[PDB]
Each structure stands twice: as C-alpha cells, then as structure tokens.
A paper describes a structure:
The one-year chemical-exposed structure (1Yr-Y) crystallized in the orthorhombic space group P212121 and is refined isotropically due to the data resolution of 1.68 Å. We see that rhenium coordination occurs again at the His15A residue [Re—Nimidazole bond distance = 2.5 (2) Å, occupancy of 80%] and at His15B [Re—Nimidazole bond distance = 2.6 (2) Å, occupancy of 75%]. Two rhenium atoms (occupancy 26 and 27%) occur in the vicinity of Glu7A and Lys1A with Re⋯Re distance of 3.2 (2) Å which is within range of formal interactions as typical Re⋯Re cluster distances are 3.46 and 3.40 Å, while Re⋯Re van der Waals interactions are less than 4.3 Å. Lastly, coordination also occurs at Asp119B [Re–OD2 = 2.3 (2) Å, Re–OD1 = 3.1 (2) Å; occupancy of 62%]. c density to allow the identification of the rhenium atoms, occur at six positions within the protein, namely at Leu129A (occupancy 50%; as specified above); Arg5A (occupancy 45%); Trp63A–Ser100A (occupancy 42%); Gly71A–Trp62A–Arg61A (occupancy 45%); Pro70A (occupancy of 27%); and at Asn103A–Arg112A (occupancy of 13%). c density is available to fully refine the carbonyl ligands and these have been removed from the refinement utilizing the monomer CIF ligand, QEB. In the 1Yr-Y crystal structure, it is remarkable that these clusters form by drawing to them rheniums bound to different amino acids, all except the tri­carbonyl rhenium which remains bound to the histidine.
The X-ray crystal structures presented here are for the protein hen egg-white lysozyme incubated with a rhenium tri­carbonyl tri­bromo compound for periods of one and two years. These reveal a completed, very well resolved, tetra-rhenium cluster after two years and an intermediate state, where the carbonyl ligands to the rhenium cluster are not yet clearly resolved, after one year. We report here the formation of tetranuclear rhenium(I) tri­carbonyl clusters in HEWL protein incubated with the starting synthon fac-[NEt4]2[Re(CO)3(Br)3] over a period of 24 months. A dense tetranuclear rhenium cluster, and its technetium form, offer enhanced contrast in medical imaging.
Residue numbers in the entry: 1 to 129
The structure:
Amino acid sequence: KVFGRCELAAAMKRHGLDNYRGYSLGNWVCAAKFESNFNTQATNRNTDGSTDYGILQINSRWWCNDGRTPGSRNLCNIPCSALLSSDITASVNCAKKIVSDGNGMNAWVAWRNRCKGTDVQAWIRGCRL
Ligand SMILES: [Cl-]
Ligand SMILES: [Cl-]
Ligand code: NA
Ligand SMILES: [Re]
Ligand SMILES: [Re]
Ligand SMILES: [Re]
Ligand SMILES: [Re]
Ligand SMILES: [Re]
Ligand SMILES: [Re]
Ligand SMILES: [Re]
C-alpha cells in the first residue's frame, strides 16, 4: 500500500508514534517519505547483503528475519515480510524498538540527513489529527 501524507500520519499517530521517545509525529512522517515514499512494499538491498523493508525501511541485519542475511539477528522477532503489509502494525512496533535502543531516530539515515533539525511539523500541516 502507498499511503497518502495525512493518511500515514493518522495511522502512525493511532499506533502510538506521536512523541514516542520524544519524537513528534512529523519526524516519523518525514522519515517515511524519504525512506519508502510512503510505500509499504518498498524494499532495498544494502551493500552488506541485508535488505530494508517497508514504510520505514527496517533492516534485516538486526531487526527482522528474511532467511538470507546470515549472521544477522531478529530483534523484532518478525519475518521481514510482515513489514510490507498494508497494516503498519508490524513496522510501528519494530520502529518503537529501534528508536528506544539509545540512538533515537539516527538509526534512519534519511531522517538523520533530511529531517533532523528541520521544521518536521510541516509534514503534518493540514492533516485533521
Ligand atoms: Cl537470516
Ligand atoms: Cl533521542
Ligand atoms: Na535478520
Ligand atoms: Re483506510
Ligand atoms: Re486508516
Ligand atoms: Re501530535
Ligand atoms: Re534508505
Ligand atoms: Re539501509
Ligand atoms: Re512551520
Ligand atoms: Re486533535
């Protein structure tokens, strides 16, 4: 599923991401735009052989299992394919675990380079939240 801007924000907010670990909702919307283009089915192979999955491009090196990243872990205890569902529950729950591991949203390269420090609230303006 390809989410619309405000449709995704509402879903992320419904799933507990607004101010989760002190990150306002716009941070999560901004990151998702640059990571996945709001497309739950996004996949990208990393140089190390791992793969990023879903609307937040969660990585199989640490977080999910895709049966082709040897020597990796599965800290979210989920198949990476669950992160591509139209239901964003799997991605939100795993993102909550990632953002709590001490590095905050710096785990997301797109956020670090294109959202961190900007007016991320502009990503939720107009949305009826
Ligand atoms: Cl594996
Ligand atoms: Cl933080
Ligand atoms: Na893995
Ligand atoms: Re919906
Ligand atoms: Re929805
Ligand atoms: Re909010
Ligand atoms: Re990415
Ligand atoms: Re990545
Ligand atoms: Re703003
Ligand atoms: Re509200």
